[PDB]
Amino acid sequence: INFQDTETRYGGIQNQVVNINQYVQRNPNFIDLDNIAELSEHSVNTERVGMSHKEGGWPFKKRIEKDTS
Amino acid sequence: LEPKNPQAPKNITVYDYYTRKFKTDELVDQMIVHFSMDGDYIWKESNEYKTQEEIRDTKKALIKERNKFNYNTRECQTINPSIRERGVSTEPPPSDTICGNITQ
Amino acid sequence: NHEPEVKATDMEEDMIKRVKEIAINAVKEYKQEKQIAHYIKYEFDKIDGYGWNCIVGRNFGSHIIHQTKKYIFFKINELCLLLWKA
Amino acid sequence: IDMPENSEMKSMKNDAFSQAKFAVENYKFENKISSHIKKFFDEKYGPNWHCVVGKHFNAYVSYDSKNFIFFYEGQLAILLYRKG
Amino acid sequence: PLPPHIIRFNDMAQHLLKKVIRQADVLIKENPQGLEKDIALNLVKFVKSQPEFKIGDGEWQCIIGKNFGCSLTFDANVLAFFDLLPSRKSILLFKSG
Amino acid sequence: EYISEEVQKAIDDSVKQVFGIKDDSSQVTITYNKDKVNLWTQQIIDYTIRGLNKLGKHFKYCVTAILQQTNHAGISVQITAYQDTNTDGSLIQCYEINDIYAIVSVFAMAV
Amino acid sequence: LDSLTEQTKMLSTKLSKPVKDIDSLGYVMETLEQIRKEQAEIDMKFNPVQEMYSLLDNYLPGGITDKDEMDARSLLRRNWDILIQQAEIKGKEYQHK
Amino acid sequence: YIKNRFYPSKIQKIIKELFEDRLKGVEYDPNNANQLSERLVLELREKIKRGKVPRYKIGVQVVFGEIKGQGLRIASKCLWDVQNDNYASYTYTSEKVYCTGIVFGCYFE
Amino acid sequence: QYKTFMGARVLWPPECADDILEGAIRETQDALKKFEIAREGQKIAEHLKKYMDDHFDPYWHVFFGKNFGCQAVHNKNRFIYFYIEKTAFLMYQTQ
């Protein structure tokens, strides 16, 4: 897992300053500003586990009575 | 994978003041953005040079003939209810536990 | 749902009706405060040139001016919409 | 035993009872009950409400004056109040 | 270090807003009770005084509120709207355009 | 044996060298043009791939570009693929000058 | 009711009292309109009276002492209606002439 | 066979807590930015050491800078069988600095 | 498989962040130990949400008990779910 390594490189760009027809600002500029935030819905629940049986009264410890008899 | 964007909500709601309901919206935009910057530098556009230079021209010619007669102050404020912090309690209802025998 | 209602106004009748319609349409179409204000400011900039201002909120205070017959403040379903020019 | 108050005329107090009594019987999970109450009151009066249902819970919220209703409905307890 | 806050929208150079934050904070602390009228008046009377804030198309306006929305023809240069976390007062500052 | 940071550096060199000018006036005397947008897209892509094959790396690349006219419409750019952990990957880039909303999406894979 | 009514009727009597402020107005009309903007806040500080007299005249219509109640409350709203009407009409005719 | 698994947000935990309590609103001083990163990267690595993932290999990566009229885009791609391997990523930006950390996780097999 | 944490059984790995975690994982038992008892109900969650809103982001929701379990959608990465001595704690932040 010994994973040492290093690199480096650089880009940049051409340079040219024209400065003949420059320095404008459209003064009657328009922008759209808000004061709002996003939303969501954390809809929560409860986990539920419920089942019924029917207890049946007596009708022998050994299934076959002849074996004991 | 069809990427989901972390650091995002999943659905957007907002109140409609024409139809007095809400209405949620479960499609959320998922493009991470930080530092949008608005600019105001406008170079030989057709639409903006006219609309700026014309208004400055008309204002300055008008003043060359304060000029619009003096304005009038106004005031309006809305009704601001107060914020109170009140907290109440429910209680677990009580229960009884007896024991009885079976008679003859 | 409920129709608009002016709490303070300085407009003519036909001009009141236009802002009524534009407010109803804005609230039916858009659902955000800046979007509604931007849309109504745009509508009245198209119909009445440049210089409209529209404040759309729930509790704010204002000290403004306007052209004498271009001001209105009305409420729709607990929405305070103020509008004026210059 | 406990009945926090709201505006007069019984405009919303009379409404909340009649709505929550249908809500409780109509559903088993509290989800549909509370969502029903809140969704109704949103259409009816306000932009944003808050509702809680349950047998036992304590709470402490900020709200808007005379917009806080709380009642012991049957075995359950229903809290409601406007906020926003 | 500045006091904590949430700039919801700013347009002026950042030092203008620094000054606004510091004075608005110390002013909310010096006037913790009363009406936002006094806050607005003191803030305008302070902000209008400095040799800074030289440029203005109209003049100064400040609005304090807790639940609203607006839209103004603010001067394209100066505009600020932010919040003071302890008291949560949405405060707004600009110059009339 | 690479870095997507430098991949992005090369993409930026390509784009800002082709059309980006430091002095910001020719960039709006060059606004979106129906006639010249074809030349723009093709030449942006060609110069970008020339920058990419300047690299002697044995990895395999593929490129996609998007040019949007105006911010009013809105757009969502999303990426997803299925490749090998160590060496493969991708890259995206958004770009704006005055009235041109450029987007570049590159995939880099091994072999 | 008496206090709020004396205020509104004072505004009306300022509109009507001097032949000067009747013909040649001044900055005093700006103060009248200022009080008209305030009239929101004035009814805001008056609203405790509307609900209270509602509770009173719920089971106590009066008829004996309701004289001054009628005078004052109807005088308030009289100033309000002449406000709307005279504001419009006076604005128009002062524009004409 | 993966009994103990990696899900993103406990490393997302560690990385958040680390970021606030260590950055504490520090400014971007050029002479010590790289070494600040060097310190907190190793601290983060120590934290993932107790991060309770036996075979998940951890490709730590961190970015730290200052925001100054500067638009930026950072993105990565995920490259693994979604059943076992996963990632985590957090961002933390104050008024004038931004530090964002990502941590890979690849189940060894 | 609900791995152990120096505070409690936490679903490892969870969906939240550790200043919130460590804060809650220390603050839940700190609150329960200092002057609080299991006999009282939600005057616990009261102080818990108060402490969370004081330091961390303001809009939290807390649910704890002996029988519950939730699906939902919230703020990304703001989900604390941990058991402690057979008592499930769940917390999530919503913008």
Coordinates of N, CA and C in Angstrom, one line a residue, chain E:
Chain E
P1 N -11.1 39.7 13.3 CA -12.2 38.8 12.7 C -13.6 39.5 12.9
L2 N -14.3 39.4 11.8 CA -15.7 40.0 11.8 C -16.6 39.2 12.8
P3 N -17.7 39.8 13.2 CA -18.7 39.0 13.9 C -19.5 38.1 12.9
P4 N -19.9 37.0 13.3 CA -20.6 36.1 12.3 C -21.9 36.7 11.8
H5 N -22.2 36.3 10.6 CA -23.4 36.9 9.9 C -23.5 36.1 8.6
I6 N -24.7 36.4 7.9 CA -25.0 35.7 6.7 C -25.3 36.8 5.7
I7 N -24.4 37.1 4.7 CA -24.6 38.0 3.7 C -25.5 37.3 2.7
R8 N -26.7 37.8 2.6 CA -27.6 37.1 1.6 C -27.4 37.8 0.2
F9 N -27.0 39.0 0.2 CA -26.7 39.7 -1.1 C -26.0 40.9 -0.9
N10 N -24.8 41.0 -1.5 CA -24.0 42.3 -1.4 C -23.4 42.6 -2.7
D11 N -23.3 43.9 -3.0 CA -22.8 44.5 -4.2 C -21.6 45.4 -4.1
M12 N -21.4 46.1 -2.9 CA -20.4 47.0 -2.7 C -19.1 46.3 -2.4
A13 N -18.0 47.1 -2.5 CA -16.7 46.6 -2.1 C -16.7 46.1 -0.7
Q14 N -15.8 45.2 -0.4 CA -16.1 44.4 0.9 C -15.8 45.2 2.1
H15 N -15.0 46.2 2.0 CA -14.6 47.0 3.2 C -15.8 47.9 3.6
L16 N -16.6 48.4 2.7 CA -17.9 49.0 3.0 C -18.7 48.1 3.8
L17 N -18.9 46.9 3.4 CA -19.7 45.9 4.2 C -19.0 45.6 5.5
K18 N -17.7 45.6 5.6 CA -17.0 45.4 6.9 C -17.5 46.5 7.9
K19 N -17.4 47.7 7.5 CA -17.8 48.8 8.3 C -19.3 48.7 8.7
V20 N -20.1 48.3 7.7 CA -21.5 48.2 8.0 C -21.7 47.1 9.0
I21 N -21.0 45.9 8.9 CA -21.2 44.8 9.8 C -20.8 45.3 11.2
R22 N -19.6 45.9 11.4 CA -19.2 46.3 12.7 C -20.1 47.3 13.4
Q23 N -20.5 48.3 12.6 CA -21.4 49.3 13.3 C -22.8 48.8 13.5
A24 N -23.3 48.0 12.6 CA -24.6 47.4 12.8 C -24.6 46.5 14.0
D25 N -23.5 45.7 14.2 CA -23.5 44.8 15.3 C -23.4 45.6 16.6
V26 N -22.5 46.5 16.7 CA -22.3 47.3 18.0 C -23.6 48.1 18.2
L27 N -24.3 48.5 17.2 CA -25.5 49.3 17.3 C -26.7 48.4 17.8
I28 N -26.8 47.2 17.2 CA -27.9 46.3 17.7 C -27.6 45.9 19.2
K29 N -26.3 45.9 19.6 CA -26.0 45.6 21.0 C -26.3 46.9 21.9
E30 N -26.0 48.1 21.4 CA -26.3 49.3 22.2 C -27.8 49.6 22.3
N31 N -28.5 49.1 21.3 CA -30.0 49.4 21.3 C -30.7 48.0 21.2
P32 N -30.6 47.2 22.3 CA -31.2 45.9 22.3 C -32.7 45.9 22.4
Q33 N -33.3 47.0 22.8 CA -34.8 47.1 23.0 C -35.3 48.4 22.4
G34 N -36.6 48.5 22.2 CA -37.2 49.6 21.5 C -37.7 49.1 20.1
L35 N -37.7 50.0 19.2 CA -38.2 49.7 17.8 C -37.1 49.8 16.8
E36 N -37.2 49.1 15.7 CA -36.3 49.1 14.6 C -36.2 50.5 14.0
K37 N -37.1 51.4 14.4 CA -37.0 52.8 14.0 C -35.7 53.4 14.5
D38 N -35.4 53.3 15.8 CA -34.2 53.8 16.3 C -33.0 53.2 15.7
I39 N -33.0 51.9 15.4 CA -31.9 51.2 14.7 C -31.6 51.9 13.4
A40 N -32.7 52.0 12.6 CA -32.6 52.6 11.3 C -32.1 54.0 11.3
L41 N -32.6 54.8 12.3 CA -32.2 56.2 12.4 C -30.7 56.4 12.7
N42 N -30.3 55.6 13.7 CA -28.9 55.7 14.1 C -28.0 55.2 13.0
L43 N -28.4 54.1 12.3 CA -27.6 53.6 11.2 C -27.5 54.6 10.1
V44 N -28.6 55.2 9.7 CA -28.5 56.2 8.6 C -27.6 57.4 9.1
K45 N -27.8 57.9 10.3 CA -27.1 59.0 10.8 C -25.6 58.7 10.9
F46 N -25.2 57.5 11.1 CA -23.8 57.2 11.2 C -23.3 57.0 9.8
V47 N -24.0 56.2 8.9 CA -23.5 55.9 7.6 C -23.4 57.1 6.7
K48 N -24.3 58.1 6.8 CA -24.3 59.3 6.1 C -23.2 60.2 6.5
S49 N -22.5 60.0 7.6 CA -21.6 60.9 8.2 C -20.2 60.8 7.7
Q50 N -19.8 59.5 7.5 CA -18.4 59.3 7.1 C -18.0 60.0 5.8
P51 N -16.8 60.5 5.7 CA -16.3 60.9 4.4 C -16.3 59.9 3.4
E52 N -16.3 58.6 3.8 CA -16.5 57.5 2.8 C -17.9 57.4 2.4
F53 N -18.3 56.5 1.6 CA -19.6 56.4 0.9 C -19.8 57.7 0.1
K54 N -18.8 58.2 -0.6 CA -18.9 59.4 -1.3 C -20.0 59.4 -2.4
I55 N -20.0 58.4 -3.2 CA -20.9 58.5 -4.4 C -22.3 58.1 -4.0
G56 N -23.3 58.8 -4.5 CA -24.7 58.5 -4.3 C -25.6 59.1 -5.4
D57 N -26.4 58.2 -6.0 CA -27.3 58.7 -7.0 C -28.5 59.4 -6.3
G58 N -29.2 58.7 -5.5 CA -30.2 59.3 -4.7 C -29.7 59.6 -3.3
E59 N -30.1 58.9 -2.3 CA -29.6 59.0 -0.9 C -29.9 57.7 -0.2
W60 N -29.5 57.7 1.1 CA -29.5 56.5 1.9 C -30.9 56.0 2.3
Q61 N -31.1 54.7 2.3 CA -32.3 54.1 2.8 C -31.8 52.8 3.5
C62 N -32.4 52.5 4.7 CA -32.2 51.3 5.4 C -33.6 50.7 5.8
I63 N -33.8 49.4 5.7 CA -35.0 48.7 6.1 C -34.6 47.6 7.0
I64 N -35.3 47.5 8.1 CA -35.2 46.3 9.0 C -36.5 45.6 9.0
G65 N -36.5 44.3 9.0 CA -37.7 43.4 8.9 C -37.3 42.0 9.2
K66 N -38.3 41.2 9.5 CA -38.1 39.8 9.9 C -38.8 38.9 8.9
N67 N -39.7 39.3 8.0 CA -40.4 38.5 7.0 C -40.9 39.3 5.9
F68 N -40.2 39.4 4.8 CA -40.6 40.3 3.7 C -39.9 39.9 2.4
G69 N -40.3 40.6 1.4 CA -39.5 40.6 0.1 C -39.7 41.9 -0.6
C70 N -38.7 42.3 -1.4 CA -38.8 43.6 -2.0 C -38.1 43.5 -3.4
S71 N -38.1 44.7 -4.1 CA -37.4 44.8 -5.3 C -37.3 46.3 -5.6
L72 N -36.0 46.8 -5.7 CA -35.8 48.3 -5.8 C -34.9 48.6 -7.0
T73 N -35.1 49.8 -7.5 CA -34.1 50.4 -8.5 C -33.0 51.0 -7.7
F74 N -32.2 50.1 -7.0 CA -31.0 50.5 -6.3 C -30.0 51.0 -7.2
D75 N -29.1 51.9 -6.7 CA -28.0 52.3 -7.5 C -27.1 51.1 -7.8
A76 N -26.8 50.9 -9.0 CA -26.1 49.7 -9.5 C -24.8 49.4 -8.7
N77 N -24.3 50.4 -7.9 CA -23.1 50.2 -7.2 C -23.3 49.6 -5.8
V78 N -24.1 50.2 -5.0 CA -24.2 49.9 -3.6 C -25.5 49.2 -3.3
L79 N -25.4 48.1 -2.6 CA -26.5 47.3 -2.1 C -26.0 46.3 -1.1
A80 N -26.7 46.1 0.0 CA -26.3 45.1 1.0 C -27.6 44.6 1.7
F81 N -27.6 43.3 1.9 CA -28.7 42.6 2.6 C -28.1 41.4 3.3
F82 N -28.2 41.4 4.6 CA -27.6 40.3 5.4 C -28.3 40.1 6.7
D83 N -27.8 39.3 7.6 CA -28.5 38.9 8.8 C -27.5 38.8 9.9
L84 N -27.9 39.2 11.1 CA -27.2 39.1 12.3 C -27.6 37.8 13.1
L85 N -26.8 36.8 13.1 CA -27.2 35.5 13.6 C -27.8 35.5 15.0
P86 N -27.3 36.2 16.0 CA -27.9 36.2 17.3 C -29.4 36.6 17.4
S87 N -29.7 37.8 16.8 CA -31.0 38.3 16.8 C -31.8 37.9 15.5
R88 N -31.2 37.6 14.4 CA -31.8 37.2 13.2 C -32.7 38.4 12.6
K89 N -32.0 39.5 12.4 CA -32.7 40.6 11.8 C -32.2 40.8 10.4
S90 N -33.1 40.6 9.4 CA -32.7 40.8 8.0 C -32.6 42.3 7.7
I91 N -31.4 42.8 7.6 CA -31.2 44.2 7.4 C -30.7 44.5 6.0
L92 N -31.2 45.6 5.5 CA -31.1 46.0 4.1 C -30.6 47.4 4.0
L93 N -29.7 47.7 3.1 CA -29.1 49.0 2.9 C -28.7 49.3 1.5
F94 N -29.0 50.5 1.0 CA -28.8 50.8 -0.4 C -28.9 52.3 -0.6
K95 N -28.8 52.8 -1.8 CA -29.0 54.1 -2.2 C -30.0 54.2 -3.3
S96 N -31.0 55.1 -3.2 CA -32.0 55.2 -4.2 C -31.4 55.5 -5.6
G97 N -31.9 54.8 -6.6 CA -31.5 55.0 -7.9 C -32.5 55.9 -8.7

